[PDB]
Design a protein around this ligand. Structure first.
Ligand SMILES: Nc1nc2c(ncn2[C@H]2C[C@H](O)[C@@H](COP(=O)(O)OP(=O)(O)OP(=O)(O)O)O2)c(=O)[nH]1
Ligand SMILES: [Ca+2]
Ligand SMILES: [Ca+2]
Ligand SMILES: [Ca+2]
Length: 341
DNA sequence: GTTGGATGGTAGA
DNA sequence: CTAACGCTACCATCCAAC
């Protein structure tokens, strides 16, 4: 069983660089401008030239422009990146129809039938890298292992423009030597709970009773980790089904005023609903980010599917209920649909 | 007890 | 306006309901 994971390098900024090759070689920061004020918003991605100066996904545009004034700052054109991505994901389908598109820029390919071994996998990895470079001039990092998790870990270790096989033996080495924080699904919160438990490595999750581990990081994560540590993890490459579609916007300024907020919400509905495309949601959540950036949400799951009209009406009620059960001003308002029929 | 929805936490794209 | 986007997936947990 062999999983080839592809993660496009600095995706958004690279697409920007491919569209505008005069950009390659200098810092490119792809930004999501919130609109509140001059350069309000956050960096979506920066190329590695920008990253060398700490401009990375998540920092405020003004921080980025503080630490990297000269860079090229480009609005995020998510649809453009999605088009390139889909073309690449299609390229990847020509290597394995058994593909899991995990995000805009990463897929797992089960290549067990395409390859007999890690060496052919590697060769396929190179082939895959070249095809995407030929077809889309996008460099990608390839991570090959016996499962998704380690293929992702392989890729993280090889980024950018890398290719890395974690064979069955390194898998066993990494279960023992890899900081468990480096395991996908283990963020800062889980890492810092695993430290407390003295769990620094996947292997340490076997040296602990389930419930004590569970009682810290949760049943699912505990099982996950233990299954990884056991070299049993064998989650299949399954075609992903969007479970939720949503749209959230920053408001020009914070508001507790429904009438000022609604336009944003309805836009989020219009856009969410447009992006549902055929999919009928049974659940709608109005998500509000407050002044202090707490995320608050009120949702409803109807038996049957929600129409755009019912979305408009229910969202306003849910927004009503947010405004009512939380005293804070709302800074971002969004909607999220889910439970598709 | 246990579903499953509401809501939030966490991780990550 | 004064930093903190927007997006999804998964899961924990509370609580009402069954
Ligand atoms: N708006 C926004 N988009 C993000 C964020 N993080 C990632 N993305 C989008 C932009 C990235 O180009 C794309 C792929 O995610 P990655 O984590 O793989 O970032 P990227 O490819 O740019 O770096 P790469 O060389 O893997 O490390 O996902 C984020 O925090 N905000
Ligand atoms: Ca990634
Ligand atoms: Ca990437
Ligand atoms: Ca981590």
């Amino acid at each position: 069983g062999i999983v080839l994971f592809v993660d496009f390098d600095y995706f958004y900024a690279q697409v920007e660089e491919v569209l505008n090759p005069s950009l390659k070689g200098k810092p490119v920061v792809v930004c999501v401008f919130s609109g509140r004020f001059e350069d309000s918003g956050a960096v979506a991605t920066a190329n590695y030239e920008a990253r060398k100066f700490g401009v990375k996904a998540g920092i405020p545009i003004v921080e980025a422009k503080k630490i990297l004034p000269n860079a090229v700052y480009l609005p995020m054109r998510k649809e453009v990146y999605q088009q390139v991505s889909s073309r690449i994901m299609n390229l990847l389908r020509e290597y394995s129809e058994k593909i899991e598109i995990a995000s805009i820029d990463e897929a797992y390919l089960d290549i067990s039938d395409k390859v007999r071994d890690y060496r052919e996998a590697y060769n396929l990895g190179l082939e895959i890298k070249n095809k995407i470079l030929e077809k889309e001039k996008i460099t990608v990092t390839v991570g090959i292992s016996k499962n998704k998790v380690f293929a992702k870990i392989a890729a993280d270790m090889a980024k950018p423009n890398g290719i890395k096989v974690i064979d069955d033996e390194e898998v066993k080495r990494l279960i023992r030597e890899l900081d468990i924080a480096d395991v996908p699904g283990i963020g800062n919160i889980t890492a810092e709970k695993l430290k407390k438990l003295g769990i620094n490595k996947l292997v340490d999750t076997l040296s602990i009773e389930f419930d004590k581990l569970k009682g810290m990081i949760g049943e699912a994560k505990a099982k996950y980790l233990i299954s990884l540590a056991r070299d049993e993890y064998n989650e299949p490459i399954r075609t992903r089904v969007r479970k939720s579609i949503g749209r959230i916007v920053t408001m020009k300024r914070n508001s507790r005023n429904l009438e000022e907020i609604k336009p944003y919400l309805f836009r989020a509905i219009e856009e969410s609903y447009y992006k549902l495309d055929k999919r009928i949601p049974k659940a709608i959540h109005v998500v509000a980010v407050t002044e202090d950036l707490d995320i608050v949400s009120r949702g409803r799951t109807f038996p049957h599917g929600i129409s755009k009209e019912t979305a408009y009406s229910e969202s306003v009620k849910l927004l009503q209920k947010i405004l009512e059960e939380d005293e804070r001003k709302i800074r971002r308002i969004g909607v999220r649909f889910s439970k598709f029929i």
